[PDB]
Structures are given as structure tokens and as C-alpha cells.
């Protein structure tokens with residue numbers, strides 16, 4: 616068995632290996648990358664996502680989200696308070712302000728310490744989940760707006776044509792902006808490219824151990840767990856590495872820098888934080904290996920998780936028994 620300790624693997628594809636996206640994912644899996652839940656891909660030196668980032672300031676962040684925490688430093692939830700619209704240039708200036716800017720630090724590990732010590736005492740503002748792309752249309756390799764769609768994958772594997780679309784999303788971050796512990800919708804893959812700016816630190820639980828994280832979460836967030844049998848689908852709970860280690864939960868960590876891709880694999884729980892002003896692009900995708908995970912994915916039906924239009928068909932075809940209850944949660 617390849618990668619039996621479920622370490623995060625880092626790949627350096629050549630420009631020739633960068634041509635065929637599906638083939639390279641399958642290669643990474645042949646080497647055991649998925650066992651970690653997360654892999655890093657450093658693009659060949661010849662590649663670029665676009666020519667420059669000098670002209671992005673007028674992108675609008677219609678609904679910036681202030682991430683307000685509750686709990687203790689290592690075990691907390693966050694809610695998202697909607698703020699007034701602002702441009703990316705306005706948001707960059709805000710991120711760099713004395714109130715929001717990254718503190719002085721020695722190295723990534725020092726900054727990580729500071730994050731976990733102090734995150735709860737601040738409420739950073741995240742420009743998350745913005746439909747759009749920063750890849751140039753002429754970028755032919757690993758262009759996240761040009762990937763094979765999940766609907767087409769389901770049709771290819773299973774024979775059933777379904778409605779829905781699959782487009783990327785932009786994320787504008789600042790120091791302490793946080794992504795809560797989650798797997799993807801329908802336990803899909805995700806791919807995330809850090810276009811510019813400061814790093815993003817990731818934590819991940821191997822897919823084979825995801826239920827250990829779920830059991831801890833039920834213990835740590837006992838009200839939330841009574842409310843919903845899949846409350847991590849709400850994407851609000853944080854648990855620190857220290858707490859994970861105290862509770863024996865297997866996990867790994869890695870820091871993504873600008874110019875690097877990360878792939879999350881089906882049922883790979885992940886969480887993390889941004890170091891300072893940055894912009895990432897991410898999208899979900901599927902492969903043949905996903906289908907079995909999609910069929911088994913948990914679902915939130917309490918009403919909180921509320922998701923895209925295109926998840927309807929995935930539930931309807933892959934999980935027909937659950938469909939009625941899940942759709943009630945959507946309406």
C-alpha cells in the first residue's frame with residue numbers, strides 16, 4: 616500500500632505531465648497521495664496562471680464576511696456577519712491596516728502559534744465564495760475554469776444526464792481568516808490555487824480516519840451535534856492541532872504559498888487560515904473514484920448547510936433514499 620502513514624505528498628510535474636489533468640490526479644493517487652486527504656502540486660516553472668495581477672482591484676466583494684468566534688482558543692465556532700460591499704482594492708487596504716495586518720513573526724511556525732493563541736480575540740473579514748476566475752483564458756493547463764464538469768463525470772460513469780453547472784470561486788483573505796473543519800459537498804475533491812499574496816496554512820485528517828474527527832467534534836460541540844447529525848456540513852467548527860493531538864486524532868499540516876495548488880481528496884476533512892492578504896481560486900471536481908464516496912456522503916437536513924443548485928441532482932441520483940429529507944432541509 617503506497618503512503619501507509621498518510622503523509623501529505625508534494626508533486627513537481629513537468630510541463631509535459633501538466634497537460635492532462637485527469638491523468639495526473641490518477642498518477643498522484645497511484646503513489647498514495649489521497650491517503651493524506653490533501654496534496655500539494657507545484658506547477659512547472661514554464662507555467663503561469665495569467666500575466667499579472669496588476670488589474671484586479673475593481674473586482675467587487677459584494678458580501679464580505681466578518682468571522683466572529685465563540686468558545687475557547689482551541690475549540691471554537693465562528694459565525695459570519697455580513698458587511699457592506701467593497702472592492703478588492705478597498706479590501707486589500709483594509710487587510711493591510713493596523714487593525715487587521717499580520718503581526719511581526721519569525722517564521723510560519725511562530726505565526727501558527729500566534730494564530731491559535733489569539734484568533735478568537737479578533738474578527739477578520741473574509742471575501743469568500745465569489746463566483747469567478749483569475750485564470751487567463753489562454754492558460755490551457757490546470758485552468759480551474761476549464762475542468763471537466765462533475766455532471767459530465769456522473770454521466771460518463773453512470774449513464775444519466777443531469778442538470779447543473781460547476782464554476783470556480785474566488786476567495787480574498789486576510790490575516791486570521793479561517794476555514795472551518797469540513798469535507799466538500801457530496802465528499803467531492805477540491806482544487807485550490809493560491810494566485811497571490813500571503814500563505815494559507817492547512818490541516819487535514821486522512822479520509823480513512825475521518826470518523827475519528829467526527830466523533831471528537833460531537834464531544835466538543837455537543838449542542839450542535841444534537842441539532843444535526845452532520846453539523847460539520849455547517850462549516851463553523853474549529854479545533855486546534857493541540858486539541859487534536861491531545862485527543863489522538865491523526866492529522867497533518869502544510870503551508871501553501873502563492874503559485875501552488877492544493878488538492879483535497881474525497882472525505883478528507885480540512886481546515887486552515889490565511890497569513891495575510893491573499894487571493895485563492897477553488898472548485899470542486901470528481902473522478903471515477905469519487906462515485907463511491909458520493910453515494911455514502913453524509914448529509915445535513917436541519918436546514919443550516921444550504922448549498923448550490925447542482926447538489927440536488929447528486930443527491931437525487933446517488934442517494935435516492937435520502938433525497939426527500941435532504942430536499943426538505945433545502946426548502
Ligand SMILES: O=C(O)CNC(=O)C(=O)O
Pocket residue numbers: 786793794805806807815879885895897898
Ligand atoms: O481557501 C479557503 O478558504 C477554503 N478552501 C477550501 O476549503 C478548499 O479549497 O477546499
Ligand SMILES: [Mg+2]
Pocket residue numbers: 670671672673674
Ligand atoms: Mg479589476
Ligand code: NI
Pocket residue numbers: 797798799805879885
Ligand atoms: Ni474545502
Ligand SMILES: [Zn+2]
Pocket residue numbers: 842843844845846848849915916917918919920
Ligand atoms: Zn445541519
